[PDB]
Amino acid sequence: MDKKYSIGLDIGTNSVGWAVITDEYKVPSKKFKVLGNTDRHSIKKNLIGALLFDSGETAEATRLKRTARRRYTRRKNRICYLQEIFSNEMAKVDDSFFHRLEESFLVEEDKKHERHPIFGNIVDEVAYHEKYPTIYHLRKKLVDSTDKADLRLIYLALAHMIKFRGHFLIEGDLNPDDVDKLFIQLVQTYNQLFEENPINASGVDAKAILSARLSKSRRLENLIAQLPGEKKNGLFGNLIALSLGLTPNFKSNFDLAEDAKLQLSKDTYDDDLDNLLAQIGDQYADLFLAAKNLSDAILLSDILRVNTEITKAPLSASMIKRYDEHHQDLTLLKALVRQQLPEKYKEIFFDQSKNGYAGYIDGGASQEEFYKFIKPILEKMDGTEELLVKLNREDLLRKQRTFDNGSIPHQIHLGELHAILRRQEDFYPFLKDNREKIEKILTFRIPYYVGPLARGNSRFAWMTRKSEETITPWNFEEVVDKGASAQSFIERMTNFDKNLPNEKVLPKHSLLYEYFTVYNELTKVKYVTEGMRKPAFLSGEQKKAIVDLLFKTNRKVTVKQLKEDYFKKIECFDSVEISGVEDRFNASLGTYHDLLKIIKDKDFLDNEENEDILEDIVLTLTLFEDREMIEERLKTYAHLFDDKVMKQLKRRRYTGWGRLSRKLINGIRDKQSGKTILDFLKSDGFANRNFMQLIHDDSLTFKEDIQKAQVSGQGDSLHEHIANLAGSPAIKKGILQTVKVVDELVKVMGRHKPENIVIEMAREKNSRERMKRIEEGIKELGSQILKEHPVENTQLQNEKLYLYYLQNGRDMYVDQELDINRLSDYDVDHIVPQSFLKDDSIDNKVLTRSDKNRGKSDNVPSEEVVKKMKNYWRQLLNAKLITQRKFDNLTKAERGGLSELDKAGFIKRQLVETRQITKHVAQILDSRMNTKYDENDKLIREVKVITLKSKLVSDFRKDFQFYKVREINNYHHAHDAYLNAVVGTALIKKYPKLESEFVYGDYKVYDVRKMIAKSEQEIGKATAKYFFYSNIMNFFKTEITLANGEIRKRPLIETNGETGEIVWDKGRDFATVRKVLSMPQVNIVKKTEVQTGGFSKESILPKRNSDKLIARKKDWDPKKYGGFDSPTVAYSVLVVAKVEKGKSKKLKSVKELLGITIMERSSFEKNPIDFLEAKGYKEVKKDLIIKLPKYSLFELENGRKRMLASAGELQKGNELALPSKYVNFLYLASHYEKLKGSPEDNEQKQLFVEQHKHYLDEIIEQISEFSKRVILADANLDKVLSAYNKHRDKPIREQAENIIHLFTLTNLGAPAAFKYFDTTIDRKRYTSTKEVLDATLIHQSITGLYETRIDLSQLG
RNA sequence: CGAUAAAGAUGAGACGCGUUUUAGAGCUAGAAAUAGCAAGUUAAAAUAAGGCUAGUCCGUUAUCAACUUGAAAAAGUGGCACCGAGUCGGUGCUU
DNA sequence: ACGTTTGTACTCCAGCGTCTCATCTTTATGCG
DNA sequence: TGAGACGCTGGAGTACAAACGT
Ligand SMILES: [Mg+2]
């Protein structure tokens, strides 16, 4: 049989609702066979439900942890390189030194050598630690002591700098220098060179004006303000070049010959400074050197707080100053505390639990916490003025290793390491040869375009090797093919050609592509002759002629008439008849002109044999941005020219990639005539054929393109096609589950395709922005709006008084004040009525002290109220209070009333969705369903895929009182899918000619301007498609209210205009929808998933005696070293075995549920029996092991259901089917103050909800019965009942708003805490999965219709 | 209509902390329990256990009923109408 | 008739900041 | 430029009464 049905879907990020409806909007019921060893053999289920799953995670955290792993590996390798340099000479000094350093973590018992790592004896270690309290004392000593040192100490200093080498954000050289002296020298050079209008901001110390903690822009403003005459571009050119790595252009700020932006801290700075010095003429030379010296001084000013005149290690000397001043402040604070407050001494200096000094040093308190703790003590104390001054400066009792050390670059550490190497090079000859080698160890850094240095066993690697040997920092440039790796870095990410998915895409500035754009805009154009109106075709002679004369002489082409006139200087004139070509051609040769200008010879650019040289040049310029790669690549082309053109074109840069390959432009020869797409675009042969036209058939190019498209595509896979879509991974998971649900539903209904599939995807500072807009409008209008009332952000949510403020305290349609004392005076009126479109947003809403401005169904009346309000709306639109579209709608009556084009726009706004992801999933479903072809090879639409927006179904909820409360249960997903199906199939049945507007596929347009052409005297049963009013859903309502105070009735049974088929019966279909929404059984299924991710919590706990700790390495006992804790269970396994119980060695047979940690998953799957015997179970039944992932469903007595959260915790698995009357009452009561409707409807709802005050007790009884049946939380239920009895004498609105909160006790899933009325009910957790082991295990399919029930009591 | 900008996704290269164990001899009185006092800023190693494919790779993303074939990819497995509805039940035909 | 493991009830806790570079879609916005 | 910080839900420890073996 045909078995007509439809499928509705509600795709979400956490759920997928589905429903099957018949032609009468009924959900069919079916009985399904259940497998397993249970007695149950058939169960009846409705064909409606939802699938719940955890949200998909993006691959960001995994990428960050992978990068961290690579960084740790490379840091360890750096330390290993330094060790293997030092090893040979270290064996002659202390042979066990590196072994003692490696084993320093483990305890004294496990050490193979002495406990003291550095010297190996107690006396020398104590003497060393007394002489150098920190590593920075040793670093400064080794820089400045000019005496032979112990090689251990030299290694310790170099290893400290190599391990923590600082950042690489500043390129080029940097050295220690004051900032004020540098500014004085900059001003000196400025005055010396200019000798006219000298900027002399004397008395204004630039020190700490530029060095202020404010941003570079604010420091620049502070410096420029103190400058007497000089302001902005000019002096701030040099100032901003000092302050930042980017600076304004030297063409205006320094009179340079070209628009070259200045730079700093980059390799491009040297080349651009050379170019700017050449352009200016060396007049600005050394005036930029003074600025660069000031830049270095300003950059180092806040990291090296010590004078450089006494040492070459300012960093270490600054750290020693910090240590010394920490010691002085600590002893002063100790003396002051004991003398003033001896009772607080123990709390401050001994208690690690608080945020005192003991908690700051030995405890977990940070610097900010310590400052916050000790600040009120220092205020309450006297004689601590310098301590407070240091505290507000954040310079009190600081540590050397702090969070703020990230500003130290690598050049400072490199300078200290170089100083030490140069100081200790005489005594150790090996250090002299390895000096450059150790320096290269510190400064080496893998380029971002090279990536991981893999041999081939890596997903993420693209590096190519010039030689097959190990990569070290010293042979990196000799082994790694940097140019090929940099090319592959970009070419692995650029998208392939859509027509042929095998080869790459051509750069967007390529010559062969720009010529394609110009000639594809050429061949379609054909000037109209004067003799005959025939446009003919712009022939190839004029193809070359136009491009050579105009495009090849101007960047942007001339005007339409100007380009003609230019050609008419060589052709017939006074005949300007363009081929409807645009005013100015969109195409532009911009890269050929750049190449001709750089090469300084047009012959090179004109040369067609030299087109490949140009192509490779543009590809090199687009690919690389490091300029060393460009230099290396273009070095091969130096012969074709000279050095000047080489360095002029090396600085050129292009961005962007096209969408065609070279094959699709000049590769495919198009069979007959042997000419490529470009050649057809040159000479169409009096046919004037565009790219789109030519890429079709009749030239055999379409056959080869289709062959490549199908061959390379290979059908891919559904998972693959979903993978390379846009959007979040969570919505990709939702789409995949949706497709699998559709396949299962098709299988369920006798392998019969549905007639229709309805698609809907959930798309779920503006208050502060609205408050700012109200303030700006009040300031612009000069009105005392705040005097009436301030813009309260508490009231910024509510839309009632929005009009009392935005409309200038004046009625919108009436020329008087709005009377803000009475908000009930105003009545919200939609500008374009709801019979036209549901524009409930405030863009259309307006209020006029309830004045009947219009007696017409038009938006406003012609002139009249519109005219009077239009002037004030001109004022409000000037203030932007009235929106542009708002004013357009308000003026539309004086603009001719409501037009047919306007109504067409309203219904296309109500119907069409603009999201591309919805189009993608609709295309996927249509491709999967419609798979048959006709005899002429034409697709036949067995099913239709309808896409709907949320506004339609939401309005269907609000108008017809099918109210949704999310907190009650998960049935609302399935109900949304059912109403999705009902609305979609009613719309396609009642309006068939609008199927091009919301159904996927190539459909006849059926222009709505002819449909919406009905007048006030409605045609009815005609081609007008009942589209005068133009609300697409208005046909659902029995009586359509109008803004003119009239009610237009609509017949009880709706039918199609052309076909005589009943599409909506208002007397039976609403009852059917109500019955379906009141059905107690819908298939809610939680997707069982094996947990993946981290092994455990990342916190490394201190050592305990517990066995819950996890060893951090193989031979690190957690009892001695601490370790990780609280692992994550991948899945639980039900084992049946005999265990060693009792001191009498008894094999007590036991059935247990053991969880498999993610760490142990591979070991368990390699050999489950060996793993279980290792765990402690003897004689395991191998075939009785049941893998139970998370959310595994178990059924118990009285229908109680539990989901497996873990091996030792359960979740609630039941669903509360609250009756429709109670959820409707709860929605109406909770939304008392936010009814958002007509005043009569609001009064009726208030009367209905006041008449059913007893419904609260019934809802409480329902919750109590459901909790006593399946929840089994006695104490929480008693607290809930006591709280409800306590707050009985409360208004209905808050009572129902908190009864809504009460539903989380009975909600499906993990238990959660909730608050009813100032009382918090903590969650009751089922932390014992012992009753599960004798329950019924339910294996569910994706829809849950197919089941397999296993009685676990019978296993064992 | 170009064009910019934001958001999101993906990949690479790097810093600074944080945590853990050890090293930085605690002194005095008391037999000890305990007290009074002195100190404290730093370093080494690890930073998912680990894997082989031994790279200066890889290891937290995606995929996720049960059962029957297949190494895997994957394929295959479950009757329909009507009356009703507290998580689905009952009746009739054929299997 | 105690010890001994198990079942409620409650509390606490969970690695985090920054920078450079590149490639895509998809929306939007001011621009024409 | 502008901070807004938070939940979530499973593990672990602690205290104490009760089902439970000898
Ligand atoms: Mg939903």
**Catalytic choice (A593, A830, A972, A975):** A830
Q: Is A10 a catalytic residue?
A: yes
- Tell me: is residue A1002 an annotated ligand-binding position: no
A511 vs A612: CA distance, rounded Å: 9
End-to-end CA distance of chain A: 47
Q: Compute the distance from residue A979 Cα to the ligand 1 centre, in Å.
A: 11
Task: Please state whether strand B lies within 7 Å of residue A357 at its CB atom.
Answer: yes
Burial level of A882, CB count in 10 A (0-12/13-18/19+)? Answer: buried
Give me the CA A43–C1' B89 separation in Å, rounded: 10
CA distances to A79, A436, A490 from A611, rounded to whole Å, are 51, 45, 23
For residue A585, the one-letter residue type is F
Cβ A50 vs Cβ A1085: under 8 Å: yes
Task: Please state whether strand B lies within 7 Å of residue A1093 at its CB atom.
Answer: yes
Those residues whose beta carbon sits under 5 angstroms from the ion ligand 1 are A 973, 976
Q: Is A7 helix (H, G, I), strand (E, B) or coil?
A: strand
Alpha-helix runs per DSSP H in A641-690: 643-650, 662-666, 677-682
A760 vs A704: CA distance, rounded Å: 37
A639 vs A631: CA distance, rounded Å: 14
- The H or E element containing residue A586 is none
Q: Is A1320 helix (H, G, I), strand (E, B) or coil?
A: strand
- Domain edges within chain A: 179-300, 314-408, 455-494, 511-694, 766-893, 1211-1330
Q: Compute the distance from residue A762 Cα to the ligand 1 centre, in Å.
A: 7
Cβ A1190 vs Cβ A1090: under 8 Å: yes
DSSP character at residue A518? H
Cα torsion angle, A424, A428, A432, A435, sign:
negative
The total of other beta-carbon atoms located within 10 Å of residue A434's CB is 19
Check residues 299 to 338 of chain A and report those whose beta carbon is under 7 Å from nucleic acid strand B. 322-323, 326-327, 330-331, 334, 338
DSSP character at residue A259? -
Give the bases of strand C that a protein CB approaches within 7 Å: 6-11, 13-28
Give me the CA A1278–C1' D8 separation in Å, rounded: 26
A970 vs A405: CA distance, rounded Å: 51
Q: Compute the distance from residue A13 Cα to the ligand 1 centre, in Å.
A: 10
The total of other beta-carbon atoms located within 10 Å of residue A762's CB is 16
Give me the CA A1143–C1' C5 separation in Å, rounded: 14
Cβ A8 vs Cβ A984: under 8 Å: yes
Cβ A1286 vs Cβ A1293: under 8 Å: no
Structure tokens at A360: 């700051």
Give me the CA A1339–C1' B51 separation in Å, rounded: 34
Q: Compute the distance from residue A964 Cα to the ligand 1 centre, in Å.
A: 10
A558 vs A576: CA distance, rounded Å: 14
Strand ranges in A12-142 using DSSP code E only, listed in sequence order: 15-21, 29-35, 42-46, 48-52
DSSP bridge pairs for A10: A17
A568 vs A402: CA distance, rounded Å: 76
DSSP character at residue A1020? -
Burial level of A336, CB count in 10 A (0-12/13-18/19+)? Answer: middle
Which value in Å is the resolution of this experimental model? 2.8
Cβ A494 vs Cβ A504: under 8 Å: yes
Q: Compute the distance from residue A1054 Cα to the ligand 1 centre, in Å.
A: 29
Closest CA to A177 of A169, A165, A187, A186: A186
Q: Compute the distance from residue A10 Cα to the ligand 1 centre, in Å.
A: 6
DSSP character at residue A1304? G
Q: Is A4 helix (H, G, I), strand (E, B) or coil?
A: coil
A617 vs A243: CA distance, rounded Å: 36
CA distances to A69, A357, A1214 from A57, rounded to whole Å, are 20, 42, 27
Give me the CA A30–C1' B93 separation in Å, rounded: 16
Please report residues contacting nucleic strand D, using a CB cutoff of 7 A.
Answer: A 215, 217-218, 1104, 1106, 1108, 1125-1129, 1142, 1144, 1155, 1190, 1205-1209, 1211, 1309-1310, 1312-1313, 1323
Cβ A1089 vs Cβ A54: under 8 Å: yes
Cβ A1041 vs Cβ A1029: under 8 Å: no
A728 vs A57: CA distance, rounded Å: 9
DSSP character at residue A817? B
For residue A149, the one-letter residue type is A
Task: Please state whether strand B lies within 7 Å of residue A1047 at its CB atom.
Answer: no
- The H or E element containing residue A846 is strand A845-847
Task: Please state whether strand B lies within 7 Å of residue A613 at its CB atom.
Answer: no
The set of residues, in sequence order, having a beta carbon less than 8 Å from that of A1198 and lying 6+ positions away, is A1269, A1270
Task: Please state whether strand B lies within 7 Å of residue A105 at its CB atom.
Answer: yes
- Tell me: is residue A973 an annotated ligand-binding position: yes
Give me the CA A914–C1' C30 separation in Å, rounded: 21
DSSP bridge pairs for A757: A7, A945
- The DSSP secondary structure of A1109-1177, one letter per residue, reads -EESSTT--HHHH-EE-S--EEEEEEEEEEEEETTTTEEEEEEEEEEEETTTHHHHHH-HHHHHHHHTE
Give me the CA A181–C1' B17 separation in Å, rounded: 34
- The DSSP secondary structure of A1234-1264, one letter per residue, reads T--S-HHHHHHHHHHHHHTTTHHHHHHHHHH
Check residues 75 to 104 of chain A and report those whose beta carbon is under 7 Å from nucleic acid strand B. 75-79, 101-102, 104
The set of residues, in sequence order, having a beta carbon less than 8 Å from that of A1135 and lying 6+ positions away, is A1151, A1152, A1153, A1154, A1172, A1177, A1180, A1181, A1184, A1185
CA distances to A144, A175, A296, A405 from A313, rounded to whole Å, are 8, 11, 16, 16
Closest CA to A944 of A890, A915, A987: A987
b or e along A1176-1198 (b: 16 or more beta carbons within 10 Å of the residue's beta carbon)? ebeebeeeebbbbebbbbbbbee
A176 vs A305: CA distance, rounded Å: 11
Q: Compute the distance from residue A610 Cα to the ligand 1 centre, in Å.
A: 62
CA dihedral A329, A332, A338, A340 (to 10 degrees): -100
The total of other beta-carbon atoms located within 10 Å of residue A817's CB is 14
